[PDB]
Design a binder for this molecule. Structure first.
Ligand code: MN
Ligand code: MN
Ligand code: MN
Ligand code: MN
Lengths: 247, 241
DNA sequence: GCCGGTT
DNA sequence: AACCGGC
DNA sequence: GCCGGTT
DNA sequence: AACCGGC
């Protein structure tokens, strides 16, 4: 990670930080503001990075050619926008924040990519693990890493900002940081109903995986396929059986 | 619908207004059907305020006088229990309905969907196909076939400089649509997805029929998704394990 | 504690 | 509660 | 037109 | 992008 060396800083700055009454999505901006101040040459919003990539290559027009600028099938897959959106891009028609985008922030350096999400949590409310990332997208990601042998190109990490309502604004009370690729893949909770999302709180994320990036991919694909099989038959029991009587 | 007879009115007041764009409608409905119109959370408060005698969740759950409505409108046991005149419910993202209209102990559940017609059409989550399944099951077990409708109002808008402007609307009734026509997007939180404007309204049977017909559709689509899971999520990745 | 459905 | 983009 | 994954 | 409640 690029932000880990200064995490203790981020942690200490964000704590006690307040914002005017995700619900706490103004806390993301602080993290981005901070990143952009201490690692400014590394820090991008995902759309910002796409904009920079294309601005550096004005000659390169069309989606075909523009996709080539990625030098990576897995990154092309995680990062790019659609073909018409890419074809249509211009200095006048730049990319903007996109609901669906994979990552909140990109830390890039020497061709190594850290995709960073900021999750925000209302510590008052009962714990409810948030959607992290699509288990399916993650399966595809794992398959593309293996097919193209990209096991040393990018990490997917998380920064959780705990907050509470203090009078008339939100205040951050603590944070956590975890690395997707350091967890035991077979331990990832896939919530099929919840748009097929891996779900957890960062603070709970296991961080003891031992093998290589390749082994993680293989093991996650095993876990995915197993959970998918289980869910298939588990659907008959929960969504069919209970209703058969009425028909 | 209580809304339908005055749809022209609504349409006419909304078209051209300026400001996802959370668009009133509530305002209009309130100022024209005051004693019929409620946010969901507000209707809950109303119900409990009107019965200070009752306390505890079990007792206040009886105030609904309907297993189905209880299923659709009520908060959890604890939050009900802890409800107080000095501790009211607030808007909850999770609530079934945007607006509830009730007259003569009949309920119209109204969602207001918004839509940027500048962008390319993408059917929105409407309601959980699994929630709807439980709903029809409850309607049948409890013979509540004349109690509530679930209806939708689509506000089409478009960005003009600084201000976002409504430029058309649609209204449909869920229980007038061909149940087997309803698109159940499993991956999308098991949601029914449609735009209102596109919603079949040619159903002619009874409420009971609709419910039984829907459950048949649901059970069928659940099996199909179960099976489809193998091809979509299993075979494509086996070559790696 | 464990678990998964909904906006 | 929306939201894009493959073919 | 058709269809369905993601934040 | 997060959000409750059943036992
Ligand atoms: Mn993101
Ligand atoms: Mn975020
Ligand atoms: Mn609603
Ligand atoms: Mn709405």
């Amino acid at each position: 990670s690029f932000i880990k060396p200064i995490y203790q800083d981020i942690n200490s700055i964000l704590i006690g930080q307040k914002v005017k009454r995700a619900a706490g999505e103004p806390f993301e901006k602080l993290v981005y503001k901070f990143l952009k101040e201490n690692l400014s040459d590394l820090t991008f919003k995902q759309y910002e990075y796409l904009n920079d990539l294309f601005m550096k290559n004005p000659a390169i027009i069309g989606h075909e050619a523009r996709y080539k600028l990625f030098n990576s099938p897995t990154l092309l897959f995680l990062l790019s926008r659609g073909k018409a959106a890419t074809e249509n891009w211009s200095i006048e028609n730049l990319f903007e924040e996109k609901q669906n985008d994979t990552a909140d922030i990109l830390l890039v350096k020497d061709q190594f990519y850290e995709l960073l999400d900021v999750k925000t949590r209302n510590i008052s409310k009962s714990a409810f693990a948030p959607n992290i990332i699509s288990a399916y997208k993650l399966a595809q990601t794992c398959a593309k890493m293996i097919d193209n042998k990209e096991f040393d190109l990018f990490d997917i990490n998380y920064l959780e900002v705990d907050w509470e309502l203090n009078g008339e604004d939100l205040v951050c009370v603590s944070t956590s940081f975890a690395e997707l690729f350091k967890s035991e893949p077979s331990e990832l909770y896939i919530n099929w109903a919840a748009a097929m999302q891996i779900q957890f709180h960062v603070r709970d994320l296991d961080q003891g995986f031992n093998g290589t990036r390749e082994e993680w991919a293989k093991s996650y694909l095993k876990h995915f396929v197993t959970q998918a099989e289980q869910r298939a038959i588990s659907m008959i029991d929960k969504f069919v059986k209970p209703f058969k009587k009425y028909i």
